[PDB]
Design a protein around this motif. Sequence first.
Motif, PDB file in Angstrom:
ATOM      1  N   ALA A  71      -2.320   2.040   2.482  1.00  0.00           N
ATOM      2  CA  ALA A  71      -3.497   1.487   1.890  1.00  0.00           C
ATOM      3  C   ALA A  71      -3.430   1.422   0.378  1.00  0.00           C
ATOM      4  N   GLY A  72      -4.087   0.500  -0.212  1.00  0.00           N
ATOM      5  CA  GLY A  72      -4.293   0.372  -1.642  1.00  0.00           C
ATOM      6  C   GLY A  72      -5.749   0.028  -1.882  1.00  0.00           C
ATOM      7  N   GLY A 108       0.780  -1.227   0.000  1.00  0.00           N
ATOM      8  CA  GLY A 108       0.000   0.000   0.000  1.00  0.00           C
ATOM      9  C   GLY A 108       0.813   1.279   0.000  1.00  0.00           C
TER      10      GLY A 108
HETATM   11  C1  MMA Z   1      -4.304  -4.427  -4.767  1.00  0.00           C
HETATM   12  O1  MMA Z   1      -2.988  -3.936  -4.435  1.00  0.00           O
HETATM   13  C2  MMA Z   1      -2.929  -2.735  -3.745  1.00  0.00           C
HETATM   14  O2  MMA Z   1      -3.551  -2.874  -2.475  1.00  0.00           O
HETATM   15  C3  MMA Z   1      -2.878  -3.690  -1.513  1.00  0.00           C
HETATM   16  C4  MMA Z   1      -3.657  -3.567  -0.201  1.00  0.00           C
HETATM   17  O3  MMA Z   1      -5.051  -3.627  -0.456  1.00  0.00           O
HETATM   18  C5  MMA Z   1      -1.421  -3.282  -1.328  1.00  0.00           C
HETATM   19  O4  MMA Z   1      -0.756  -4.241  -0.515  1.00  0.00           O
HETATM   20  C6  MMA Z   1      -0.707  -3.192  -2.667  1.00  0.00           C
HETATM   21  O5  MMA Z   1       0.597  -2.669  -2.440  1.00  0.00           O
HETATM   22  C7  MMA Z   1      -1.473  -2.281  -3.614  1.00  0.00           C
HETATM   23  O6  MMA Z   1      -1.447  -0.948  -3.124  1.00  0.00           O
END
Ligand code: MMA
Lengths: 438, 438
Positions: B424-425, B305
């Motif tokens: 977060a992602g 994230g």
């Molecule tokens: C789908 O990928 C994204 O989201 C996940 C958490 O949801 C993170 O670990 C990753 O680096 C990306 O930002």
Amino acid sequence: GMISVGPWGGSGGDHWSFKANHAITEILIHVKDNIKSISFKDAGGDISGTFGGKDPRENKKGEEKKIGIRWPTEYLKSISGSYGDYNGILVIRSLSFITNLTTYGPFGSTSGGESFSIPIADSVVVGFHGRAGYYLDALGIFVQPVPHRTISFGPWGGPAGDDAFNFKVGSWIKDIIVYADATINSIAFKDADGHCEKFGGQDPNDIGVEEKVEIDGNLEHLTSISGTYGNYKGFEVLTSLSFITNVTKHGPFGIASGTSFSRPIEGSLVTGFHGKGGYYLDSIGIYVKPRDGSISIGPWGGSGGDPWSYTANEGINQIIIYAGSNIKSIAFKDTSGLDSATFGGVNPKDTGEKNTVSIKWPSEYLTSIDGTYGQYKFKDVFTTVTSLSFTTNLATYGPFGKASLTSFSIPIHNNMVVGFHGRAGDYLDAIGIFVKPD
Amino acid sequence: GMISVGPWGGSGGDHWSFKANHAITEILIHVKDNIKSISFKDAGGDISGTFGGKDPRENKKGEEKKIGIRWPTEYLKSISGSYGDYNGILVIRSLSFITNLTTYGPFGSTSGGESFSIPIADSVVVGFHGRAGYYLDALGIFVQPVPHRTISFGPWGGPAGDDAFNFKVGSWIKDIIVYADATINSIAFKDADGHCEKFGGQDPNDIGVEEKVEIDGNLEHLTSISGTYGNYKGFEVLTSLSFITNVTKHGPFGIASGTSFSRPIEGSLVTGFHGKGGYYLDSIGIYVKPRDGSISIGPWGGSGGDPWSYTANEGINQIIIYAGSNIKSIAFKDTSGLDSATFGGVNPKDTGEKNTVSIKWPSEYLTSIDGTYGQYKFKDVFTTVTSLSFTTNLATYGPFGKASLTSFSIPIHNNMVVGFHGRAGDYLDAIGIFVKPD
Ligand SMILES: CO[C@H]1O[C@H](CO)[C@@H](O)[C@H](O)[C@@H]1O
Ligand SMILES: CO[C@H]1O[C@H](CO)[C@@H](O)[C@H](O)[C@@H]1O
Ligand SMILES: CO[C@H]1O[C@H](CO)[C@@H](O)[C@H](O)[C@@H]1O
Ligand SMILES: CO[C@H]1O[C@H](CO)[C@@H](O)[C@H](O)[C@@H]1O
Ligand SMILES: CO[C@H]1O[C@H](CO)[C@@H](O)[C@H](O)[C@@H]1O
Ligand SMILES: CO[C@H]1O[C@H](CO)[C@@H](O)[C@H](O)[C@@H]1O
């Protein structure tokens, strides 16, 4: 923070208060039979307003005097002066300016009023407050300790007492134990932690009656003292005392005889006492800190032991830890010599080995602690802190003791540790930290 | 804290600065062809010193005027005035006092010098600073936002632009994306968190050239802006801009044409922007907070994230959390409407269910968080926060989500949570808190 002292003088005019950002380097007054006005200059060259001087009559301008304080070598430590009637009003009639090198003054009339002086040590005047209109109705000072010191008031009483005492506490003054009837026979003190103290009371023929004051230190705090000193059975001693709080006055204990001492202070916390005793209480003074909050983390460990806490006044310099298969005791040293008690290690048959942490203050300062707690059996089974480590902004120190299964840590940043707390008896049952930002 | 504005006038005399403890309720001036002196009174009745008035000549006393501010209903919001030569010295020649109800003034000569005004909204004057000897060489103000608002400057430029924009950020302004050649074509912004923004740039025939400013926000911060506005292809628009920091000036971008705007501010942080665009950048203003530290705890969770953070400007009022078998997203609302972005929930096929926490500010305020983190598999396996709860001084709220094996908590007291951070992602990978004492 800063402690207020005074103001002295009348209740006419308008109130004012000037805290200088840097050291006070100049005082200007206008004065004739009284002080018409006052203003200040600070080491960086900011001026305060001119307080007073508003009489429209040209006669009533007074004469300008400038007192220069020869910073950084000279610093203002105190003032003296006098107040009295001036054409009908209770007003500052004269002033002196008390430096570590000398006294400037007196300026104005020393006749026709009442003088004041301050029984203070180890202070620096960092600002003024008071009252004004046409003239200088009132004036008081703001003070901070000189570096690495603690402001002192007193001592009051006589020059006798073969057993002197001094101490200061890192937490608060919680219990005061006094014996007295005709005078103050003896005085003792119980630090929030339960660490006790004693004085005077050595006359087998004059023991007085015991009284106990508990200061309920979450809401209530010891802000000042008052009392009386006089000739008692030949000795000049302290004959009554009262312990003054934001909630109430405890006492007076004893018998008011001789001369009353009071201290006009605000914003203060009494952290300590000094003076001398023998048969009775020859003399007493106080140490005060500004009533300047910390965040509290933990404590980790067992439920046993007496509560304790310690807040450094300046910054924590050293940690002494005794360990074996659990932690035995811990104590702290700060930069201004305010040692803490030893927490734990009451049993002389189980005190383990000494360890020490040194922290290179200010560029190094404590960040957090880590460790374990578990069960330790000596003569009885205890749940206490069994291992400990400390982190600074620069390094990790420890571990000390013997690791057990249950571990604790704090993933904390942009802070500093400003004290510790927990519980302890024979051992360090539990421990936590107090932190502040930056 | 407070933001400084000005001072306007000359560099003669001595510097002074007066921050009132309560609202300013009175200004006294002495004035003839210029302002001889100034002093202030506050709502609790403290006076400042009299700044200036030191000319020994009776002619040069000037006349006393008193401006009363009718607190609590009326509050000083701004000033205006003029400076110019007076008998050889660059000095404040006149002043006006700008209230929410009205204007007092002008006082003094409005001829023979240069005027100033302040393009400011939503402020309260809480103090003054400046310079003085015989007279009032210089004067500037200290300002704070009216309650629950954020101080605004500008906007500068034209009255056109069909797409208006406003926003403010809870963390800092990190990336600025500008297109420009002859003018500013368009402007965009990238919040520390990576949340982006956009404006202007709708002329297919005049697109300009892209430039990128990254503000290195640990050491560097955006303190102000400058630039230029003028007639461009018929439109009154912003034609150049520069982004001003404590480290450097980024830009100017564009072409300086028309009229230059600057803002004499200190102690500021630009938290936001407002204005309007279309083909180009018709207008722009800024929101500023006082460059008033928090302690940081955690974050707990996985390594994935983008980093994010959020500091409330006032006090956190609401939390919105989307959950399923892990935490999907989290966002915050504070008392002054400074919403945060949504952190997480980027995938529309996996956004779970809404939950909400309400906190009854000020008597209720957040104390800490608790929760678990673990592995969650959707289209790919992630290590993210899987459950969360929050504590206030009054209650615990949550839990939300699905508990896993690894749990986290903070045995913390005498604090308040003033913001959150983490990563977060698609989801809330990691989360922690920012805290302050009391
Ligand atoms: C789908 O990928 C994204 O989201 C996940 C958490 O949801 C993170 O670990 C990753 O680096 C990306 O930002
Ligand atoms: C001239 O009268 C005013 O000024 C004096 C001090 O100068 C105050 O005692 C009095 O109350 C008025 O405020
Ligand atoms: C009896 O003598 C002792 O006690 C008195 C006070 O009680 C002191 O003045 C003296 O120095 C001795 O210590
Ligand atoms: C020996 O007993 C004391 O010490 C232990 C810790 O060492 C505490 O648990 C207990 O309450 C007593 O204070
Ligand atoms: C009379 O001269 C003094 O006062 C004026 C302002 O009154 C300043 O400009 C000058 O530098 C001196 O300090
Ligand atoms: C081309 O017209 C558009 O763009 C200009 C600025 O470029 C605005 O003034 C106008 O209102 C429209 O939004």
